[PDB]
Structure 1
Amino acid sequence: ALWQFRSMIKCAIPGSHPLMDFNNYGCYCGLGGSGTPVDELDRCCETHDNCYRDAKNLDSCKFLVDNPYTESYSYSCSNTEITCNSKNNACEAFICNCDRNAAICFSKAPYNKEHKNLDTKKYC
């Protein structure tokens, strides 16, 4: 679920404020997306969007109000490491893995200040 993704990010990047740092970044970090990501971080965001689009295209999973962000799973944080709980159901595990891969991706991508609040209508 959305709150857990924010906290997965804090797990992976202890000095981060997820909503301030990664929301409305580039062309994909934020609601929807368009065009081509502008850097690796932005590209982590598109892959996450894409990862969410695949979960919805799973016939077995009917997410509340069709949003995978509503679906809570179980995970833990230790010393920078995210672990998605094996007891998560197949749909919760898919979402957990979207969020974890994204938090791990964010932690490794260069953060370019200039791509925060990008002019998307122009550059995306």
Structure 2
Amino acid sequence: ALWQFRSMIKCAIPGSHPLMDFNNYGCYCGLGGSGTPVDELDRCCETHDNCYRDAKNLDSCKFLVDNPYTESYSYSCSNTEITCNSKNNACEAFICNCDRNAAICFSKAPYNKEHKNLDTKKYC
């Protein structure tokens, strides 16, 4: 679920404030996305966007108002490492991993202040 993602990032990047940091960054971190990611962190976001698009195509998973962000799963955060509970159902397991993958992704990528609030109508 969205509230769990922010907390997974905080989990992964202790020194961060996701809302502020990754929202409206590059071409993909933020609602929608278009064009080609402007950097590596942005590509992390694009890849997550795509994860959620796949999720949506699981004929067996039918998310509330078709929004995967609405699905709550079970994960643990212990000293920088994220684990998705193995008891999550197949749909939850799937969203869990998209989130987990994005967080690690964000962790290892270089952040560019320049790319925050970009003029997407022009560079994406």
**What's the TM-score, normalizing by structure 1?**
0.99
C-alpha distance in structure 2 between counterparts of 1:75 and 1:92, whole Å: 10
Identity of aligned residues (%): 100
C-alpha distance in structure 2 between counterparts of 1:11 and 1:2, whole Å: 14
Q: CA offsets, 1:37-77, max 9 Å, x none? A: 00000000000000000000010000000000000000010
**What's the TM-score, normalizing by structure 2?**
0.99
Equivalences, count: 124
Secondary structure of the residue aligned to 2:31 is: coil
Structure 1 stretches of 4+ with a deviation exceeding 3 A read: none
1:24, CA displacement in angstroms? 0.3
1:15, CA displacement in angstroms? 0.4
1:6, CA displacement in angstroms? 0.2
C-alpha distance in structure 2 between counterparts of 1:4 and 1:25, whole Å: 20
C-alpha distance in structure 2 between counterparts of 1:16 and 1:58, whole Å: 33
Q: CA offsets, 1:100-122, max 9 Å, x none? A: 00000000110000000001000
In structure 2, list runs of 5 or more residues that go unmatched.
none
What is the aligned-residue RMSD (CA, Å)?
0.3
C-alpha distance in structure 1 between counterparts of 2:73 and 2:17, whole Å: 22
